[PDB]
Structure 1
Amino acid sequence: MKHIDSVAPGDIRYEDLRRGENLRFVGDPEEIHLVGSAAEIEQVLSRAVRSGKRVAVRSGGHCYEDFVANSDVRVVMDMSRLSAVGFDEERGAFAVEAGATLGAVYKTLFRVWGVTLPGGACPDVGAGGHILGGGYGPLSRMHGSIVDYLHAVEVVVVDASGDARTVIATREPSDPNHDLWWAHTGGGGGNFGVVVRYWLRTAEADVPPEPGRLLPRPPAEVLLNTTVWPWEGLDEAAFARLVRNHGRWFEQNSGPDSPWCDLYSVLALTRSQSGALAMTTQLDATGPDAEKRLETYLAAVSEGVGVQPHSDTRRLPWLHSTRWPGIAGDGDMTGRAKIKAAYARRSFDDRQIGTLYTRLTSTDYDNPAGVVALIAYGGKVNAVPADRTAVAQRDSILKIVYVTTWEDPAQDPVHVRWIRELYRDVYADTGGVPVPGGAADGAYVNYPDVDLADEEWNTSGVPWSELYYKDAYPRLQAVKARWDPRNVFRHALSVRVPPA
């Protein structure tokens, strides 16, 4: 509620709060403000704009790029005190403050009301960045994107005069700020203003005003499988057969009407140095033939592969399953990572598979931790028209995430080069990047990668903005001109109006 002292170099908290969770980026802000309300954010924004000081907001700190911690940022607004999660009877919707972590969101919504939101897997990700970016995760095939439930958004914006004010923008089409609401359904963090809180509830018409009916219900229990194929004895033809099995399966079973909307999985194509390839799968356990359906899927992936996978399955209550590291991730954010990603509308072709194999088995590189992970997608995501939100990829079947991780900062160039070359080579037919509307559908802004705007790495002539946003981009630039005319909110991949 009340304002408190900001954090400056010298403070015991400075080394923590000058960073997000991505340790590659160490900020030099002069002041970090632990804001407590919309009114305080307005005060912080006005003084900063009067004095010419560059601002950035930190919510959960999960940014894969240096949007918040880059050296030009002088004033951070840290949303840590604004972490409430609750049901706002005033609006008939669930309020999620920007500083709320996904783990607090899922615990509170489910323990208290028996509902959930289909966002990310990672418990520590913050609502602030995640929802704005088009968050998704294990329940997306079943329930769509988290932005599919965005009813309203409270956001502190800066007018042309440099005054800051707070506005509510709603899903109501007659709402005078409806455009700014739209831009929060995937327009991405750091662009338009400071989100204070989001309100979430089903669009559905025919619903009693009871919180327990206003958001999706998760499956009560799920089956959770780990499958591991050892690399020693996995030849190129074995690798390729497993990839192509998996792609075909997702090609045929990711429609919005598929009975497989209740499955989610991540196939990890690891460096052969790791000694094993792995897959994690989750299926709704509450229907009749659940055990069998899981086995059918696993059988499809390993069909004719010629390597016997070690397989184990456990069954867990839903909220418990969310924190199993097989789905949540291993919680270690203390290394250095570089992430790239793409939408896939169809699975890898024979050429891309060959590149994958070469690159993952290569002895030119030394790092067991590089991975290309194929994340189950589509399903109910794809029920939504591509222009209804600012998430324009509504017919994809997988997200593909290329990652490499290491320790020593002296080694940055070597790991960064490995991953740029792998990604370029996989997307070689199309300028080194996943051009929208073909085999791929561009890229996902919650996995930002500044190389998509680098002309050395992107040779497709398709700019970064179209990779992320497709035809959403002109409408996001209209919102930008309207609500952030001074371009107060910006970073290496921020929405920007046309040249004057």
Structure 2
Amino acid sequence: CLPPAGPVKVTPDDPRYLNLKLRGANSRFNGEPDYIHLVGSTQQVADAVEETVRTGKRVAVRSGGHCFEDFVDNPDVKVIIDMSLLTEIAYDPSMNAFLIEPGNTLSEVYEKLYLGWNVTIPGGVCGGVGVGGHICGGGYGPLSRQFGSVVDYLYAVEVVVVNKQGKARVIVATRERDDPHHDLWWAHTGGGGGNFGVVTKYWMRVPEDVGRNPERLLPKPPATLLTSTVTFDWAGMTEAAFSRLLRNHGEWYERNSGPDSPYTGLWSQLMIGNEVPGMGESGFMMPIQVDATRPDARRLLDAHIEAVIDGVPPAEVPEPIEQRWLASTPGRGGRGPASKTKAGYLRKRLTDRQIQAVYENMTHMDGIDYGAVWLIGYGGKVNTVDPAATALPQRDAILKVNYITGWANPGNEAKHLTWVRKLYADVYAETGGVPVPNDVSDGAYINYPDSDLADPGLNTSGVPWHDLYYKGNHPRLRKVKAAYDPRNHFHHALSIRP
């Protein structure tokens, strides 16, 4: 048993500074903090937080740096509390749950959970994403249809909070109702990070009583995944062929995203993008994976493809290769390109005029390096939980839809922004440019933040940003915010305001 790495205050002249300053995934955002505070223990965080209160310096937390907005990297932020050293992944006998510290990467968590106890959490696809912001934002992934969101497995949370006088306090907030700080736990079941305080620990556990046996405490990953990726050719893709595909795909998820459907083990995202000769994971492709544990795994995959590619000429279907769980270790580089992604939920399939709006903007994209629309699979075991039981209100969705643009040169930022905002405003034109909760839309997802939803120039409808993300859960979140962060010390562009 050893002492943790002590607190290190990384000033601009210190050689580590530039590394910690630029470790954000999105290269759009550049903050110039006074110092970056590296922490190794909960107490070090408390000492860091108190100093930011005492000095009146704007503080932001960072674990993975995979924030889509400038919540960490902006001119106004003067202190970055960097959770890089807090990387513990172990079973806690005291809590009878798995302790996952914020500074861990999803790739590092899946790795340690798999080899150690043959378990996993239904988190993000990307290996490079950090735990801290991912979980309390309501993390989901390719196993979410089979197990739910990660927040459905969040038992407890250790948070550092500031009282009105300005002093730090460490609270362990649990799931149980007899806990005095039940509200604080609930705020972290998809309430988004950078609001209530600094999370120093996550405790992950299956809600049901499975005894002290640790291998039952978290979802068991499929031993093998039966994987296939369907390619589509733009050159032969007409409007009629495009409308058919999205209708086929949308309809399939309308009737196969049930909680007790045999397609809970199947996940696929339809990636509608332009082709970049060098950039991998682009173009017009549809990665599809199914749980291969069941003997009828191949039928489920085959019945999925043919329903989607029915009457769709330009489609390429290779032979489904059965690969093991974590056969190839992820971690898509470090510093990514400058990008802007806008998000929306789907209860039903995209309307025919929305599909038309997608095709129009995908056809008209001159001077765009990368521009895509992804239709990520959702629902299933997610839609068993009450909209109010967790901080995530969207317990009705079948698809998550993202609108992405990327660019190599910062000079063309405005050029790309216009296109992705034109795409977004054309699709949700009938509901004031934004996915207002409807029979089709259900709102937005806080792990995909969009500061345009708070801007009056980009959100023409009267519906505010916080109603789009939180819906009926919003009034409760302000109640938590005012209780645990009355000084409003933790804030950003899309922070909860009392």
CA distance in 1 between counterparts of 2:244 and 2:447 reads 31
CA distance in 1 between counterparts of 2:332 and 2:347 reads 29
**Aligned position for 1:224:** 227
**Aligned position for 1:413:** 414
Q: Look up the SS of the partner of 2:362 in the other structure.
A: helix
Question: Which residue, 98, 101, 126 being the options, matches 1:97?
Answer: 101
Q: Look up the SS of the partner of 2:264 in the other structure.
A: helix
Q: Look up the SS of the partner of 2:370 in the other structure.
A: coil
**Aligned position for 2:452:** 451
Determine if contact 1:266/1:376 at 8 Å carries over to the other structure.
yes
Determine if contact 1:191/1:489 at 8 Å carries over to the other structure.
yes
Normalising by structure 1, we get a TM-score of 0.96
Would you say 1:129 and 2:130 are equivalent positions? no
CA distance in 1 between counterparts of 2:354 and 2:369 reads 21
CA distance in 1 between counterparts of 2:201 and 2:444 reads 26
> Aligned partner of 2:145: which letter?
R
**Aligned position for 2:181:** 177
| Structure 1 residue 4, shift from structure 2 partner | 3.5
Structure 2 vs 1, CA of residues 278 and 180 (structure 1 numbering), >3 Å: closer, same or farther?
same
**Aligned position for 2:464:** 463
Would you say 1:233 and 2:240 are equivalent positions? no
| Structure 1 residue 240, shift from structure 2 partner | 0.6
| Structure 1 residue 334, shift from structure 2 partner | 2.8
Determine if contact 1:25/1:66 at 8 Å carries over to the other structure.
yes
Alignment of 1:254-333 (within 5 A): 254-271=257-274, 276-320=283-327, 323=329, 330-331=332-333, 333=335
Determine if contact 1:121/1:329 at 8 Å carries over to the other structure.
no
Alignment of 1:80-119 (within 5 A): 80-119=84-123
**Aligned position for 1:59:** 63
Q: Look up the SS of the partner of 1:482 in the other structure.
A: helix
Structure 2 vs 1, CA of residues 199 and 177 (structure 1 numbering), >3 Å: closer, same or farther?
same
Structure 2: tracts of 5 or more residues without a match: none
Q: Look up the SS of the partner of 1:299 in the other structure.
A: helix
**Aligned position for 2:393:** 392
CA distance in 1 between counterparts of 2:315 and 2:60 reads 50
CA distance in 2 between counterparts of 1:221 and 1:333 reads 31
CA distance in 1 between counterparts of 2:72 and 2:301 reads 42
CA distance in 2 between counterparts of 1:297 and 1:66 reads 39
| Structure 1 residue 368, shift from structure 2 partner | 5.1
Q: Look up the SS of the partner of 1:135 in the other structure.
A: coil
Q: Deviations over 1:331-361 (max 9, x none)?
A: 4643111110100011111101111111101
Alignment of 1:345-364 (within 5 A): 345-362=347-364
> Aligned partner of 1:189: which letter?
G
- How many residue pairs were aligned? 490
CA distance in 2 between counterparts of 1:312 and 1:361 reads 30
**Aligned position for 2:83:** 79
Q: Deviations over 1:395-430 (max 9, x none)?
A: 100000110111100110000111011001100010
Q: Look up the SS of the partner of 1:319 in the other structure.
A: coil
Determine if contact 1:223/1:314 at 8 Å carries over to the other structure.
yes
Determine if contact 1:135/1:146 at 8 Å carries over to the other structure.
yes
Question: Which residue, 344, 347, 350 being the options, matches 2:346?
Answer: 344
Amino-acid identity (%):
53
| Structure 1 residue 11, shift from structure 2 partner | 2.0
**Aligned position for 2:336:** 334
CA distance in 2 between counterparts of 1:9 and 1:273 reads 37
CA distance in 1 between counterparts of 2:152 and 2:404 reads 28
Determine if contact 1:344/1:400 at 8 Å carries over to the other structure.
yes
Would you say 1:149 and 2:150 are equivalent positions? no
Question: Which segment drifts farther, 114-123 or 15-24?
Answer: 15-24
Question: Which segment drifts farther, 262-271 or 329-338?
Answer: 329-338
CA distance in 2 between counterparts of 1:305 and 1:412 reads 35
Alignment of 1:185-196 (within 5 A): 185-196=189-200
Determine if contact 1:226/1:312 at 8 Å carries over to the other structure.
no
Structure 1: tracts of 5 or more residues without a match: none
Q: Deviations over 1:151-188 (max 9, x none)?
A: 10000000001001111000010101010000000110
Question: Which residue, 246, 249, 253 being the options, matches 1:246?
Answer: 249
Determine if contact 2:25/2:334 at 8 Å carries over to the other structure.
no
Q: Look up the SS of the partner of 2:263 in the other structure.
A: helix
Would you say 1:204 and 2:208 are equivalent positions? yes
Question: Which segment drifts farther, 403-412 or 273-282?
Answer: 273-282
> Aligned partner of 1:399: which letter?
K
Structure 2 vs 1, CA of residues 333 and 5 (structure 1 numbering), >3 Å: closer, same or farther?
closer
**Aligned position for 1:11:** 14
Q: Look up the SS of the partner of 1:297 in the other structure.
A: helix
CA distance in 1 between counterparts of 2:215 and 2:127 reads 22
Q: Look up the SS of the partner of 2:426 in the other structure.
A: helix
| Structure 1 residue 330, shift from structure 2 partner | 4.5
CA distance in 1 between counterparts of 2:290 and 2:276 reads 30
**Aligned position for 2:45:** 41
Normalising by structure 2, we get a TM-score of 0.96
| Structure 1 residue 265, shift from structure 2 partner | 0.5
Q: Deviations over 1:52-73 (max 9, x none)?
A: 1111111111000000111111
Structure 2 vs 1, CA of residues 128 and 215 (structure 1 numbering), >3 Å: closer, same or farther?
same
Q: Deviations over 1:447-480 (max 9, x none)?
A: 0010011111111111000000001111000000
| Structure 1 residue 75, shift from structure 2 partner | 1.0
Q: Deviations over 1:241-286 (max 9, x none)?
A: 0110000000010011111100000101113788952100010012
Structure 2 vs 1, CA of residues 276 and 412 (structure 1 numbering), >3 Å: closer, same or farther?
closer
Question: Which residue, 159, 162, 180 being the options, matches 1:158?
Answer: 162
> Aligned partner of 1:124: which letter?
G
Determine if contact 2:158/2:202 at 8 Å carries over to the other structure.
yes
Q: Look up the SS of the partner of 1:367 in the other structure.
A: coil
Structure 2 vs 1, CA of residues 395 and 351 (structure 1 numbering), >3 Å: closer, same or farther?
same
Q: Look up the SS of the partner of 1:353 in the other structure.
A: helix
CA distance in 1 between counterparts of 2:351 and 2:82 reads 44
| Structure 1 residue 13, shift from structure 2 partner | 1.7
| Structure 1 residue 234, shift from structure 2 partner | 1.1
CA distance in 2 between counterparts of 1:230 and 1:331 reads 28
> Aligned partner of 1:17: which letter?
L
CA distance in 2 between counterparts of 1:112 and 1:334 reads 31
Taking only aligned residues, the RMSD between alpha carbons, in angstroms, comes to 1.5
Structure 2 vs 1, CA of residues 15 and 238 (structure 1 numbering), >3 Å: closer, same or farther?
same
Question: Which segment drifts farther, 265-274 or 475-484?
Answer: 265-274
